[PDB]
Enzyme design. Structure first.
Site, PDB file in Angstrom:
ATOM      1  N   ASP A   8      11.462  22.728 -43.653  1.00 30.46           N
ATOM      2  CA  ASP A   8      11.347  22.530 -44.913  1.00 30.46           C
ATOM      3  C   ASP A   8      12.449  22.632 -45.885  1.00 30.46           C
ATOM      4  O   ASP A   8      13.579  23.563 -45.498  1.00 30.46           O
ATOM      5  CB  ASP A   8      10.225  23.534 -45.282  1.00 30.46           C
ATOM      6  N   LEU A   9      12.790  21.931 -46.890  1.00 30.39           N
ATOM      7  CA  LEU A   9      13.753  22.213 -48.111  1.00 30.39           C
ATOM      8  C   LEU A   9      13.563  23.394 -48.882  1.00 30.39           C
ATOM      9  O   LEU A   9      13.962  24.628 -49.030  1.00 30.39           O
ATOM     10  CB  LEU A   9      13.814  21.034 -48.629  1.00 30.39           C
ATOM     11  N   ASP A  10      12.447  23.137 -50.115  1.00 31.64           N
ATOM     12  CA  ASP A  10      12.076  24.179 -51.051  1.00 31.64           C
ATOM     13  C   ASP A  10      11.641  25.297 -50.487  1.00 31.64           C
ATOM     14  O   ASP A  10      10.730  25.561 -49.826  1.00 31.64           O
ATOM     15  CB  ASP A  10      11.186  23.614 -52.109  1.00 31.64           C
ATOM     16  N   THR A  16      15.011  24.622 -56.278  1.00 37.10           N
ATOM     17  CA  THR A  16      15.465  24.050 -57.715  1.00 37.10           C
ATOM     18  C   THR A  16      14.302  24.562 -58.674  1.00 37.10           C
ATOM     19  O   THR A  16      14.088  23.853 -59.838  1.00 37.10           O
ATOM     20  CB  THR A  16      15.641  22.606 -57.639  1.00 37.10           C
ATOM     21  N   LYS A  45       4.056  25.847 -59.438  1.00 44.07           N
ATOM     22  CA  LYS A  45       4.893  25.880 -58.265  1.00 44.07           C
ATOM     23  C   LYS A  45       3.895  25.521 -57.143  1.00 44.07           C
ATOM     24  O   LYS A  45       2.845  26.022 -56.984  1.00 44.07           O
ATOM     25  CB  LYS A  45       5.450  27.352 -58.037  1.00 44.07           C
ATOM     26  N   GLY A  46       4.487  24.564 -56.378  1.00 45.34           N
ATOM     27  CA  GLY A  46       3.559  24.169 -55.301  1.00 45.34           C
ATOM     28  C   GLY A  46       2.551  22.962 -55.719  1.00 45.34           C
ATOM     29  O   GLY A  46       1.751  22.549 -54.921  1.00 45.34           O
ATOM     30  N   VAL A  47       2.738  22.502 -57.129  1.00 41.30           N
ATOM     31  CA  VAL A  47       1.553  21.733 -57.534  1.00 41.30           C
ATOM     32  C   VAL A  47       2.227  20.264 -57.801  1.00 41.30           C
ATOM     33  O   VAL A  47       3.507  20.102 -58.110  1.00 41.30           O
ATOM     34  CB  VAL A  47       1.053  22.085 -58.868  1.00 41.30           C
ATOM     35  N   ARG A  49       3.466  16.443 -59.508  1.00 44.25           N
ATOM     36  CA  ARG A  49       3.924  16.202 -60.666  1.00 44.25           C
ATOM     37  C   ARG A  49       2.799  15.757 -61.568  1.00 44.25           C
ATOM     38  O   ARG A  49       2.701  16.242 -62.920  1.00 44.25           O
ATOM     39  CB  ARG A  49       4.943  14.745 -60.564  1.00 44.25           C
ATOM     40  N   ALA A 115       9.009  16.845 -48.336  1.00 46.51           N
ATOM     41  CA  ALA A 115       8.400  16.088 -49.167  1.00 46.51           C
ATOM     42  C   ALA A 115       9.367  15.534 -50.407  1.00 46.51           C
ATOM     43  O   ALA A 115       9.106  14.765 -50.980  1.00 46.51           O
ATOM     44  CB  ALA A 115       7.093  16.352 -49.740  1.00 46.51           C
ATOM     45  N   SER A 116      10.325  16.099 -50.487  1.00 44.88           N
ATOM     46  CA  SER A 116      11.414  15.899 -51.518  1.00 44.88           C
ATOM     47  C   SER A 116      11.999  14.808 -51.584  1.00 44.88           C
ATOM     48  O   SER A 116      12.579  14.080 -50.611  1.00 44.88           O
ATOM     49  CB  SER A 116      12.508  16.735 -51.656  1.00 44.88           C
ATOM     50  N   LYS A 117      11.859  13.667 -52.589  1.00 44.50           N
ATOM     51  CA  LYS A 117      12.545  12.457 -52.925  1.00 44.50           C
ATOM     52  C   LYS A 117      13.850  12.502 -52.833  1.00 44.50           C
ATOM     53  O   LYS A 117      14.684  11.623 -53.012  1.00 44.50           O
ATOM     54  CB  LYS A 117      11.833  11.881 -53.763  1.00 44.50           C
ATOM     55  N   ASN A 118      14.504  13.631 -53.291  1.00 38.09           N
ATOM     56  CA  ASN A 118      15.904  13.983 -53.460  1.00 38.09           C
ATOM     57  C   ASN A 118      16.551  14.614 -52.057  1.00 38.09           C
ATOM     58  O   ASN A 118      17.596  15.271 -52.449  1.00 38.09           O
ATOM     59  CB  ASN A 118      16.224  14.574 -54.630  1.00 38.09           C
ATOM     60  N   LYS A 145       1.470  17.107 -46.621  1.00 33.81           N
ATOM     61  CA  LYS A 145       0.920  18.655 -46.159  1.00 33.81           C
ATOM     62  C   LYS A 145      -0.172  19.156 -46.892  1.00 33.81           C
ATOM     63  O   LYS A 145      -0.486  18.801 -48.037  1.00 33.81           O
ATOM     64  CB  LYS A 145       2.266  19.656 -46.398  1.00 33.81           C
ATOM     65  N   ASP A 170       7.745  27.972 -46.151  1.00 29.71           N
ATOM     66  CA  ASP A 170       7.231  29.251 -47.258  1.00 29.71           C
ATOM     67  C   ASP A 170       5.848  29.022 -47.696  1.00 29.71           C
ATOM     68  O   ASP A 170       5.601  29.686 -48.770  1.00 29.71           O
ATOM     69  CB  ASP A 170       8.399  29.283 -48.273  1.00 29.71           C
TER      70      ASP A 170
HETATM   71 MG    MG Z   1       8.677  25.010 -49.226  1.00 26.10          MG
END
Ligand code: MG
EC number: 5.4.2.6
Length: 219
Positions: A8-10, A16, A45-47, A49, A115-118, A145, A170
């Site tokens: 995972d990223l975040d 960010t 957080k985790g919700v 957009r 899931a990040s588009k960035n 997820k 996480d």
């Molecule tokens: Mg994460």
């Protein structure tokens, strides 16, 4: 041994969170909604957009059209993208760069399952692209997820089955997605959030190649 690690990223590689917060606070100030402070931002957080925006509108019992809703969500994302221009290698979490180097030197495959588009942009800004064998494209998966789709895609993209892989996450929803893929989860956080049936570490400094090898052995 395991043949791949699915990241995972975040909350694993970086976050960010400060930038998402400043963007939502700026949006609420622009439209005159009180109450978007750091403590409230914990509910975002985790919700998604769109659910985050509705929670902000609910602070003022505010009612908007579909077209206005889309424009507000676009303005917040535009401000978020301007602000992440300053991400750098300094923002990589402790331990992560050494883990990447050690996995690559042992010929273990490395994939992003975010899931990040960035995602590709953020890896470039952190100087990590050369470690990654693949990035799963979240635009090409059917379900988010806790569905396993993104983890299955990440493993397949580096030429392995998920049963040959470790996944790092996480969030409870991410851990469920890893389990259901057939990969082995190792969480970062606390069991109150993540479950007590999986191995968990308190922070990313504990994610070392020797620790991953010990976990794989015990399984
Ligand atoms: Mg994460």
């Amino acid at each position: 041994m395991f043949k791949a690690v699915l990241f995972d990223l975040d909350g694993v590689i970086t976050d960010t969170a400060e930038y998402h917060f400043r963007a939502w606070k700026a949006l609420a100030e622009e439209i005159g909604i009180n109450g978007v402070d750091r403590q409230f931002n914990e509910q975002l957080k985790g919700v998604s957009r769109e659910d985050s925006l509705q929670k902000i509108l609910d602070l003022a019992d505010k009612k908007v059209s579909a077209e206005e809703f889309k424009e507000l969500a676009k303005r917040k994302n535009d401000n978020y993208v301007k602000m992440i221009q300053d991400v750098s290698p300094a923002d990589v979490y402790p331990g992560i760069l050494q883990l990447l180097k050690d996995l690559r030197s042992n010929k273990i495959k490395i994939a992003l399952a975010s899931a990040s588009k960035n995602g590709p942009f953020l890896l470039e800004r952190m100087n990590l692209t050369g470690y990654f064998d693949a990035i799963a494209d979240p635009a090409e998966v059917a379900a988010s997820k806790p569905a396993p789709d993104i983890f299955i895609a990440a493993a397949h993209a580096v030429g392995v089955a998920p049963s040959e892989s470790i996944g790092l996450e996480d969030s409870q929803a991410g851990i469920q997605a890893i389990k259901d893929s057939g990969a082995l989860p190792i969480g970062v956080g606390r069991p109150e959030d993540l479950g007590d049936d999986i191995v968990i570490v308190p922070d990313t400094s504990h994610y070392t190649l020797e620790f991953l090898k010990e976990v794989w052995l015990q399984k």
